[PDB]
Amino acid sequence: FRPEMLQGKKVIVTGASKGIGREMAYHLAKMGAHVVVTARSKETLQKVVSHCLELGAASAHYIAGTMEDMTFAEQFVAQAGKLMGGLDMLILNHITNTSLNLFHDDIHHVRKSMEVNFLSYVVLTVAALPMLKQSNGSIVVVSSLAGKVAYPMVAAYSASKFALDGFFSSIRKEYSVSRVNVSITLCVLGLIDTETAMKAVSGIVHMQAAPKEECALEIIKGGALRQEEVYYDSSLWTTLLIRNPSRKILEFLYS
Amino acid sequence: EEFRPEMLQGKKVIVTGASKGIGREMAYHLAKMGAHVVVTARSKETLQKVVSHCLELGAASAHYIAGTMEDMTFAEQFVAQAGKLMGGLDMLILNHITNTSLNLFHDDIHHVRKSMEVNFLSYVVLTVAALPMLKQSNGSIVVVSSLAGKVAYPMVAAYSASKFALDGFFSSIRKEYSVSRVNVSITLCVLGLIDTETAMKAVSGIVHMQAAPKEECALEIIKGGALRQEEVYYDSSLWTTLLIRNPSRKILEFLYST
Numbered sequence A: 001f002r003p004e005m006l007q008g009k010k011v012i013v014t015g016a017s018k019g020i021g022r023e024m025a026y027h028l029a030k031m032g033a034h035v036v037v038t039a040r041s042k043e044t045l046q047k048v049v050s051h052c053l054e055l056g057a058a059s060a061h062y063i064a065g066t067m068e069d070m071t072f073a074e075q076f077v078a079q080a081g082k083l084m085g086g087l088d089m090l091i092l093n094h095i096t097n098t099s100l101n102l103f104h105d106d107i108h109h110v111r112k113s114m115e116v117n118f119l120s121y122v123v124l125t126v127a128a129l130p131m132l133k134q135s136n137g138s139i140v141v142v143s144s145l146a147g148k149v150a151y152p153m154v155a156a157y158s159a160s161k162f163a164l165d166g167f168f169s170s171i172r173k174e175y176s177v178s179r180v181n182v183s184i185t186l187c188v189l190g191l192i193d194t195e196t197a198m199k200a201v202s203g204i205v206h207m208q209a210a211p212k213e214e215c216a217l218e219i220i221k222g223g224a225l226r227q228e229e230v231y232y233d234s235s236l237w238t239t240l241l242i243r244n245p246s247r248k249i250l251e252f253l254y255s
Numbered sequence B: 001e002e003f004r005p006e007m008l009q010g011k012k013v014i015v016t017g018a019s020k021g022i023g024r025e026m027a028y029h030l031a032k033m034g035a036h037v038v039v040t041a042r043s044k045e046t047l048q049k050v051v052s053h054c055l056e057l058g059a060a061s062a063h064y065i066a067g068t069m070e071d072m073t074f075a076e077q078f079v080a081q082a083g084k085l086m087g088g089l090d091m092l093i094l095n096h097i098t099n100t101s102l103n104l105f106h107d108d109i110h111h112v113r114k115s116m117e118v119n120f121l122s123y124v125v126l127t128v129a130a131l132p133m134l135k136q137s138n139g140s141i142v143v144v145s146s147l148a149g150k151v152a153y154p155m156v157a158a159y160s161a162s163k164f165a166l167d168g169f170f171s172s173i174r175k176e177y178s179v180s181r182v183n184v185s186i187t188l189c190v191l192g193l194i195d196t197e198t199a200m201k202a203v204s205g206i207v208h209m210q211a212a213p214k215e216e217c218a219l220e221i222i223k224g225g226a227l228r229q230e231e232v233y234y235d236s237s238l239w240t241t242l243l244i245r246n247p248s249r250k251i252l253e254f255l256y257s258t
């Protein structure tokens, strides 16, 4: 990895107002990328754009809205496009707000989780592809342990996250033979410093929490190296245990 | 602790997507074991032709309810107006899927959405709808999935996302139910290539593997939900069974189980 890599670079970061998303903003701004950030929360985004500008961003812009809204999602990429001079890398990071609870019958939240953490990711990917094909760019899709392994209390979430792996890991095999030179990186994250995670695991989880500023960069690094996947967790056993190598082989044979 | 056709006799079993392929056979076997059976699917007389064949084999009770699992309400209600037909629900077999051909993904969000709605959401909806009854029956949910549901495949991106989703949701729920001492089993079935008409033709001149027999497949699925297993693996390759099990996942789930 060379940060010279992101020198003149055009990067969208969704879910960019707080947490791991913001920090990418800032890393991307330090590396003097161009950045367009998004979330629902307008007044927060003003604050990160201007922080990005301070930090050395080649340029920085926000566009606020909600990714339950597919036409906003599709419209978001075209404008993001036009603000910078095209697009080099698209980092899908946002998620519908969630917390730990047993699942009872909340079917609105299963649906919302599916639409916002999954479907919006497809809608943004479809819209963003022309520009990415022109730069041989990159999709970075942020997932989690619970999108690789099953965990109780995060059923909906987990379902949207498995979906992310399924859909994109499949798109990527398609791209490969389609001479579609857009890379696709799946980030698998354990617990991270962020305010909203720390508050959500409120004594429910006794798992060491990883620095958010560092995870942020790991995500960029990975996507910039066109890596199929990024694992990022504090525990040692997890990083070892989380990899599925028989998936890799099994895929070759079936290939 | 062996499998006995005897096991499924009192049992009120819903089968979905039963008007053809695996689903049909599943309802044949069930009836041969003398269970009450309700089946759904969109198309109506194909279902009549199944309810009817289902007595010739020796059910206990056979009905059907036509509707598209595209509509959450139908799903809510179908279950309701079906436990009402059998007295309770004892087993829920979920296996309907929205027609998917096999093409590279371009811009068909429509197909993606329909795929999530029909292939995943409806199963959740029906689970919710079926639960009061199952919690009581000590029932057995059984979700039919696929290799594409555990492993990546080109051509089936939207389909794959919906199968991968069934695993991440139903495995969590399994975990919650386990801690809630909710005594409902959840069986995830990973199926390889099966010689259904849909598959046969969907995959003609493209996926070059053996085609596990449909009628054998469906029994394996039942034996599975019958025995309260966490998963069943039915494919026609030795490689497959041998590689597809993921012991790291089970350990990772253990470690974290504390």
Ligand SMILES: NC(=O)C1=CN([C@@H]2O[C@H](COP(=O)(O)OP(=O)(O)OC[C@H]3O[C@@H](n4cnc5c(N)ncnc54)[C@H](OP(=O)(O)O)[C@@H]3O)[C@@H](O)[C@H]2O)C=CC1
Binding pocket: A014, A015, A016, A017, A018, A019, A020, A021, A038, A039, A040, A041, A042, A044, A065, A066, A067, A068, A092, A093, A094, A095, A096, A097, A116, A142, A143, A144, A145, A189, A190, A191, A192, A193, A194, A195, A196, A197
């Ligand atoms: N933190 C952790 O421990 C882990 C995080 N991850 C992944 O990290 C990514 C970021 O997580 P984290 O930073 O902790 O989460 P945060 O809750 O801190 O960040 C959430 C971001 O997404 C935004 N958001 C929420 N709803 C919507 C919406 N409907 N439309 C658009 N934006 C929305 C929020 O902005 P706003 O409210 O203003 O709209 C905010 O910018 C997620 O994909 C998560 O799945 C994975 C594993 C662990």
Ligand SMILES: NC(=O)C1=CN([C@@H]2O[C@H](COP(=O)(O)OP(=O)(O)OC[C@H]3O[C@@H](n4cnc5c(N)ncnc54)[C@H](OP(=O)(O)O)[C@@H]3O)[C@@H](O)[C@H]2O)C=CC1
Binding pocket: B016, B017, B018, B019, B020, B021, B022, B023, B040, B041, B042, B043, B044, B046, B067, B068, B069, B070, B094, B095, B096, B097, B098, B099, B118, B144, B145, B146, B147, B191, B192, B193, B194, B195, B196, B197, B198, B199
């Ligand atoms: N066949 C194979 O090789 C494999 C099968 N599987 C899984 O096996 C299960 C059954 O597959 P298979 O039997 O081959 O496929 P079929 O096409 O034979 O089965 C489709 C069933 O779904 C019903 N259906 C279709 N659309 C809807 C709808 N919108 N609402 C309600 N019902 C609908 C159909 O009835 P109608 O169209 O009349 O509505 C039919 O009874 C699926 O879950 C599939 O994922 C997994 C891997 C491989």
Ligand SMILES: CCC[C@]1(C)SC(NC2CCCCCCC2)=NC1=O
Binding pocket: A098, A099, A100, A144, A145, A146, A147, A151, A152, A153, A154, A157, A189, A190, A191, A196, A197, A200
């Ligand atoms: C039990 C989940 C364990 C955990 C380390 S936490 C996670 N994602 C979080 C979901 C919880 C909602 C609060 C913020 C969202 C990010 N993924 C994981 O694998």
Ligand SMILES: CCC[C@]1(C)SC(NC2CCCCCCC2)=NC1=O
Binding pocket: B097, B100, B101, B102, B146, B147, B148, B149, B153, B154, B155, B156, B159, B191, B192, B193, B194, B198, B199, B202, B207
């Ligand atoms: C490339 C698909 C490899 C295959 C064995 S076939 C599959 N599911 C089928 C999807 C095909 C659409 C029509 C029939 C429905 C069921 N799952 C797999 O793993």
